[PDB]
């Protein structure tokens, strides 16, 4: 009747009492003895120009040299970041892109947006042009993120409150993730490719299982829409980013929030979140046109990147940790080191 | 430096020529964002200009137009309305016959709730709005058998067509809290009109002149 509703409330009371039973000492209490990071001063090494509209997403390659970038001009440009050379310029069938992914093998790129379609492109054709491999159609909402598992498996997020794992060769979604209440905005695959997290507009990030299709955990710390999410390099933690002017780190094993990265001078939303290779520096894009780096164990601002004239929309650190790419709405894609 | 590297720069220098060439073809196209609360006459307008976003390309007097219909996909508007920041004008259609109809929870009241969320938006502080007040040929059904007091209890006025339709137009223009930066162009439509693409042409020409004058400092 309604006794199923009240049972859900004491079930939330059991979870909250289980989180408080493990909360003995904060992460700020343990790391008082460790050394503070010095003021990190990354300079702009390469500015990648050639886009004519707002850059909405980038993704690094696993070779840590090639990066793809998506912009509203209808162009998906693959850059050689060492020499500022444009390797490919892929015209898109709809210019309303909001995400882009680079395959771990380097053979494929994906994109998607307001067309509700994730289009996989083939870079390694015997012809010299980039062709459309597949078009993943059935997702009934604006496609917010896409991430490659393998060459044949890609997981997507959309604004239809669902995530979907796709089989590329068959063109059909094999597993649909329907736990969210609001529009899912960001993805982050785990390093072992078995789990992934997804933040949505109901201020909740959920830990998903790829093989089973079940929601393993749910984290409810934020105050508004989670725009960015990123796994720790360990795979046991992830940080979020919201319009609360707050990034916060969650733990998959303690099943609660560990630390809050917030400053009173910041009153703007976080658009992009990435970690360093060690996880010591948590980098966060902001609507204050800057990218603030955060010492992820002490919650203090280790530095700032201030070379952008508009909103830092996307952010990515290489696999070897050498560079940080910052794309923004001023049509520029800056490489920091 | 190397032979292969020099040919890679020559490939990249042939790409940014194509990006610069395709960027000029996109700047000639006038972008228009077509909105409207439900089926308020969006389908009649796109026939007059002749699963996600739906784009419609049409030309009128040597001017290329791009019209985006984003009502086909329902989600939170706050997360993708910043994609249309550089649009030339917003085409907001309101069915004038929707003053008596109520939805499941008033249908003209939801058009006024959609209008002030778009007109007073932070991404549309300077974008002109071409307000199409559709379905004026439902004069013959609605305003004689049912007065305008159903949705506007503040109004007594007159039950004639001309002064009741001017009241609905004024109630949509009073929601504009930015009177010095943007302009609301209002046209009435009966779904048997051939002059609807002309009113869009006269509106954008004013916006193109106003955008050119703000670049030169005259505004």
């Amino acid at each position, epitope marked *: 009747l309604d006794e199923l509703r009240q049972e859900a409330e004491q079930l939330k009371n059991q979870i909250r009492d289980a989180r408080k039973a493990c909360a003995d000492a904060t992460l700020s209490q343990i790391t008082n003895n460790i050394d503070p990071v010095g003021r990190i001063q990354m300079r702009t090494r390469r500015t990648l120009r050639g886009h004519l509209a707002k850059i909405y997403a980038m993704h690094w390659g696993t070779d840590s040299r090639l990066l793809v970038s998506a912009s509203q001009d209808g162009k998906l440009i693959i850059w050689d970041s060492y020499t500022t050379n444009k*390797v490919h310029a892929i015209p898109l069938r709809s210019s309303w892109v909001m995400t882009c992914a680079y395959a771990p093998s380097g053979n494929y790129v994906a994109c998607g947006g307001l067309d509700n379609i994730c289009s996989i492109y083939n870079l390694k054709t015997r012809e010299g042009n980039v062709r459309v491999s597949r078009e993943l159609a059935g997702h009934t909402g604006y496609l917010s993120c896409c991430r490659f598992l393998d060459d044949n498996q890609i997981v997507t997020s959309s604004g239809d409150t669902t995530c979907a794992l796709w089989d590329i060769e068959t063109g059909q979604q094999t597993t649909t993730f329907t736990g969210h209440t609001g529009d899912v905005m960001s993805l982050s695959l785990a390093p072992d490719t078995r789990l992934f997290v997804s933040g949505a507009c109901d201020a909740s990030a959920k830990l998903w299982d790829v093989r089973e299709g079940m929601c393993r955990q749910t984290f409810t710390g934020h105050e508004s829409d989670i725009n960015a999410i990123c796994f720790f390099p360990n795979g046991n933690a992830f940080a979020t980013g919201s319009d609360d002017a707050t990034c916060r780190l969650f733990d998959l094993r303690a099943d609660q929030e560990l630390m809050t990265y917030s400053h009173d001078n910041i009153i703007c939303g976080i658009t992009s979140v990435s970690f360093s290779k060690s996880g010591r520096l948590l980098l966060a894009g902001y609507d204050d046109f800057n990218c603030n780096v955060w010492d992820a164990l002490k919650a203090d601002r280790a530095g700032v990147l201030a070379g952008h004239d508009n909103r830092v929309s996307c952010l990515g650190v290489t696999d070897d940790g050498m560079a940080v790419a910052t794309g923004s709405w001023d049509s520029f894609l800056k490489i920091w080191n | 430096l190397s*032979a292969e590297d020099k040919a890679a720069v020559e490939r990249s220098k042939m790409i940014d020529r194509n990006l610069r060439e395709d960027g000029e073809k996109a700047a000639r196209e006038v972008k228009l964002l077509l909105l409207g609360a439900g089926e308020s006459g969006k389908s009649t307008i796109v026939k007059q200009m002749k699963t996600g976003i739906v784009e419609t390309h049409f030309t009128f007097k040597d001017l290329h137009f791009k019209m985006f219909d984003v009502g086909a996909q329902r989600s939170e508007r706050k997360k993708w309305i910043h994609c249309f920041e550089g649009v030339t004008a917003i085409i907001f259609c309101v069915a004038l016959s929707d003053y008596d109809l109520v939805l499941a929870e008033n249908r003209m009241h939801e058009s006024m709730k959609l209008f002030d969320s778009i007109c007073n938006n932070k991404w549309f502080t300077d974008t002109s709005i071409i307000l199409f007040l559709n379905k004026k040929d439902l004069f013959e059904e609605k305003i004689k058998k049912s007065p305008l007091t159903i949705c506007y209890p503040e109004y007594a006025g007159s039950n004639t067509y001309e002064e009741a339709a001017a009241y609905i137009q004024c109630q949509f223009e009073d929601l504009n809290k930015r009177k010095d930066t943007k302009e609301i162009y209002t046209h009435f439509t009966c779904s048997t009109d051939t002059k609807n693409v002309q009113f869009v042409f006269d509106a954008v020409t004013d916006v193109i002149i106003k955008n050119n004058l703000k670049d030169c400092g005259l505004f």
Partner: single-chain antibody
Amino acid sequence: VQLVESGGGLVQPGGSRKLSCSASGFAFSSFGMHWVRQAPEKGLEWVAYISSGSGTIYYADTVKGRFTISRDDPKNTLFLQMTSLRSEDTAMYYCVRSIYYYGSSPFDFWGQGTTLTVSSSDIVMTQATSSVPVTPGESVSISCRSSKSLLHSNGNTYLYWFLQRPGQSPQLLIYRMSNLASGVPERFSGSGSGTAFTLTISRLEAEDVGVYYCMQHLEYPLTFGAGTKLEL
């Protein structure tokens, strides 16, 4: 992807001819194109090169002034205007495509070639052993040596291996000294230091016989080796 050339024949010396190379099945405008000749019972040598969009055009010192390369991208045809043909111009002229970006595989597809009969400094690549007796089943190693160090400052070593089966066009085996091309098996492996290189085949088959050609791409003119023949 196919390149079929036309325009060969028997030309009197001092005459002129226009070889045409019609491209089909790939993006011709994105590919830079070469002409590589092959004299009868001799090795390959490069003639000319035209880039994408005709912005960079290079010639060999033997054919400079006399020969003229050109391309027509709406027609997918490639031309080589030959003027004042000498007695040393009798060769089979190949049409080679090559795209140039990061991680690309240039010299990947060769045309079938046309026979021209005329009726009468530079990095020297010394492929030392001309003939190797081998039988199928065991490994073989083809050595190549260069007059200059091909290891550039960007970390790339520009050595390109080719295999010409008897009666067939050459095909790419290994590009940039360690990367096997698309379509070749894992038997072929390449290693080198900058001036001395080797191409090792793991288990030799009857498909793998032919003449193996060494090539450099560090600077123009691109020079070939004399050829190492494998017999069985």
